[PDB]
Design a protein around this nucleic acid. Structure first.
Ligand SMILES: Nc1ncnc2c1ncn2[C@@H]1O[C@H](COP(=O)(O)OP(=O)(O)NP(=O)(O)O)[C@@H](O)[C@H]1O
Ligand SMILES: [Mg+2]
Length: 508
RNA sequence: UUUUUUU
């Protein structure tokens, strides 16, 4: 199917809620709901996508727009309009299915739908139910039955579960499917699930196998995504609506980016602690930040350090995939409203999450995929606000920074070195209450994580892996110490006859 | 159990 580009245009006639009302694109009832939110105007991606999504043409839509610029309402608005346009047809049936890569993002999109309901009660007849893992399955189905929603928001795993059992009852009249964070949902480990989802919806559809229109949204998207989505795009033509120049970097230009380079991976912990201390002092504790880490075990370790240093000054919140889902949801709600605090998380929080007035995004080590650099920093400087980001890495991670330049055109102007004083090392280390076995587990999680991105970030294995491993000795304040391990363990890893392996581990 | 993602 042919791709039709509509590139970023410089002198374009401004589209408004009023102009779309006058033109008959938007009904009064949705116009009213969005007007009462009192936004200055529609964001560029909203201006670009609303009419073409609702167009009577037989096309799919791909939309790219920078982090924090209103992609959610860019699809919710025309979805509501479609529901209004077809209000007498299949009114108890799901007409729009929106898929997201994390449960908390699916739940956020649902909350955005509820904000539309709150601004115009006449829209509550277009009901919405979220289908996400870690929630009571029966309770969500009671809700599907009671509310008979026209909009479903879901994560892939739970959506497949529901579809295998109830696709005939609720899903035979779907007209739109939305992949939010589309590039992520078409990576390995989501792509097959999206194909399963798309195949069921298409098979069960009462009109035809190609009825459903597909909408892809992300801040990080190109032509190569259309190829990946080939098996889920039904239509003969695909509009690529772009609000970013072809060569322009995808990172939001308002973010003040920097990188802090240490000699050792572990030193990035000390750099971050000293940075946060300074910010809490200089801002008089008026500090809201997000700090990203590579693994769940390390995230949790970092939280302990930051509670010991900073719990007297600011709340410290722990956010990753092993936090129970009830607590994930309650901490998201709190961090959205709070003026200050530090959210310490994995890439569970890299994409989509909208926490207002975050001042800074910090990163210890590299993200789980190159694109997530852009999404991580995009947690700040949202909806016209300012923001900064700091990447804390060691020397042996520098090829990541070069890869950002070569692959994504991101050049970080502010780069500086860091060397920890002996006093910061003593201060941080003394409060560490973890047993050596716990420290081994933590460092081992980092080894596995870094191993998996050696190729994509162009790391030198013989340097990055011994440096990560040496974190164990640093944290135990004895840099001669290697990680005690068994032969069978080393065999499983693949480093049993390697000098790299001998530099990292002691067969004990 | 290396980030998520039904159970
Ligand atoms: N027209 C508008 N004017 C001002 N703010 C808006 C407008 N539309 C949406 N917002 C707000 O902008 C914030 C971010 O919107 P959101 O839809 O989460 O951005 P996004 O493009 O999806 N970002 P990301 O998922 O990080 O790539 C939310 O708090 C919205 O309430
Ligand atoms: Mg979004």
């Amino acid at each position: 199917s042919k791709l039709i580009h509509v590139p970023k245009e410089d002198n374009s006639k401004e589209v408004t809620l009023d102009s779309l009302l006058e033109e008959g694109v938007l009904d009064k009832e949705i116009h009213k709901a969005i007007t009462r939110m009192e936004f200055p105007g529609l964001t560029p991606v909203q201006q670009k996508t609303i009419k073409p999504i609702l167009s009577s043409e037989d096309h799919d839509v791909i939309a790219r727009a920078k982090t924090g610029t209103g992609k959610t309402f860019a699809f919710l608005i025309p979805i509501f309009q479609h529901l209004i346009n077809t209000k007498f047809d299949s009114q108890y049936m799901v007409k729009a299915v929106i898929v997201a890569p994390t449960r908390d993002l699916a739940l956020q999109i649902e909350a955005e739908v509820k904000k539309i309901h709150d601004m115009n009660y006449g829209l509550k007849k277009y009901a919405c139910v979220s289908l996400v893992g870690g929630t009571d399955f029966r309770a969500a189905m009671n809700k599907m039955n009671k509310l008979r929603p026209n909009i479903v928001i879901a994560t892939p795993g739970r959506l497949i579960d529901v579809l295998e059992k109830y696709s005939n009852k609720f899903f035979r009249f779907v007209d739109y499917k939305v992949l939010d964070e589309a590039d992520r949902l078409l990576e390995i480990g989501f792509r097959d699930d999206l194909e399963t989802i798309s195949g069921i919806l298409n098979e069960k559809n009462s009109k035809s196998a190609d009825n459903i229109k597909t909408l892809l949204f992300s801040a990080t998207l190109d032509d190569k995504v259309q190829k990946l989505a080939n098996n889920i795009m039904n239509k003969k033509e695909c509009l690529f609506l772009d609000t970013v120049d072809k060569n322009e970097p995808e990172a939001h230009e308002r973010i003040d980016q920097s990188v802090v380079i240490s000699e050792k991976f572990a030193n990035s912990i000390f750099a971050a602690v000293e940075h946060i201390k300074k910010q809490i002092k200089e801002r008089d504790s008026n500090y809201k930040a997000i700090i990203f880490a590579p693994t769940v075990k390390f995230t949790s370790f970092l939280c302990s350090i930051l509670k010991n240093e900073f719990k007297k000054d600011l709340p410290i919140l722990e956010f990753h995939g092993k936090i129970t889902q009830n607590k994930r949801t309650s901490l998201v709600k709190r961090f959205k409203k709070d003026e200050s605090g530090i959210l310490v998380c994995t890439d569970v929080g890299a994409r989509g999450m909208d926490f207002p007035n975050v001042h800074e995004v910090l990163q210890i080590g590299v993200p789980s995929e190159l694109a997530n650099y852009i999404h991580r920093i995009g947690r700040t400087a949202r909806s016209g606000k300012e923001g900064s980001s700091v990447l804390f890495i060691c020397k042996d991670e520098l090829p990541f920074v070069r890869e950002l330049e070569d692959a994504k055109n991101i050049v970080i102007a502010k780069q500086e070195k860091y060397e920890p004083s002996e006093e910061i090392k003593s201060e941080v280390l003394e409060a560490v209450t973890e047993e050596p076995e716990d420290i081994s587990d933590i460092v081992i999680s980092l080894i596995s994580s870094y191993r998996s991105c050696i190729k994509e970030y162009r790391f030198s294995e013989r340097r990055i892996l011994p440096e990560i491993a040496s974190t164990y000795g640093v944290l135990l304040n004895d840099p001669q110490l290697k990680i005690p391990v068994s032969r069978r363990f080393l065999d499983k890893l693949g480093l049993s006859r390697s000098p790299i392996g001998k530099a990292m581990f002691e067969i004990r």
